[PDB]
Amino acid sequence: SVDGSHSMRYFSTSVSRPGRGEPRFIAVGYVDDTQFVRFDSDAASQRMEPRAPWIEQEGPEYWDEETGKVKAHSQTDRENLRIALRYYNQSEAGSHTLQMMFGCDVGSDGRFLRGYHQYAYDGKDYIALKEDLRSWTAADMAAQITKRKWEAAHVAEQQRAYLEGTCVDGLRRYLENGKETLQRTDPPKTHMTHHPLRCWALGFYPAEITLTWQRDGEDQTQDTELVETRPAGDGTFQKWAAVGEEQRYTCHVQHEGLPKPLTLRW
């Protein structure tokens, strides 16, 4: 972002399929707001697949090794879904979801900044590695059982090594190989419409953007509508903001890809 920091994220979702077979496992890899890998247990390849042109420049040993690690995750979280049933005294007939996020942050210079290692059961926090990458945050009495085990097995140290090591080494490499694509910005295209009015920012990357409304140079919060940033499908994003009574208002748009914050002439 404005820091110039870059981030690598791996997101995984496991949904149990009671009576319909083994759980569905989807894993996706993102560098900043650009996806580069994926793995779907329902797919026929049964191997980690590319989703960005600059990850194909990796060696063929990469795709074999990455496949082995994501498959281990899918098989590990399949037993964890069953352990959660015992911890929460839930039945084998219900569909449940286990989500995991892990990755690291580097700065503009490429030095290690932060690490992440969190779990969620049925969409709410289960356990997380704290920012010291040494202690755990357990959200309920079930996660306290897992936290004690992971403290006895010293899991934090094994993760802290990956987050500070293999994790950042990859992000650096992906950032350099994707220099023509990753270290760039797309300024928003601004335009305004009126209905008996709203500003539009289209085709911007990254997705970090702020749309502000000011009337006569004064911040306007009431009568204003702002929708969530949306993807267009081409790697860029879109967002709009809205507020007889007119001409006196102005829309102000801020984005790290804009030379100057934009002001919209109605």
Partner: peptide, 9 residues
């Protein structure tokens, strides 16, 4: 680079 160690709850 994915992680190489996965633990049980």
């Amino acid at each position: 680079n994915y992680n190489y160690l996965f633990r049980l709850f």
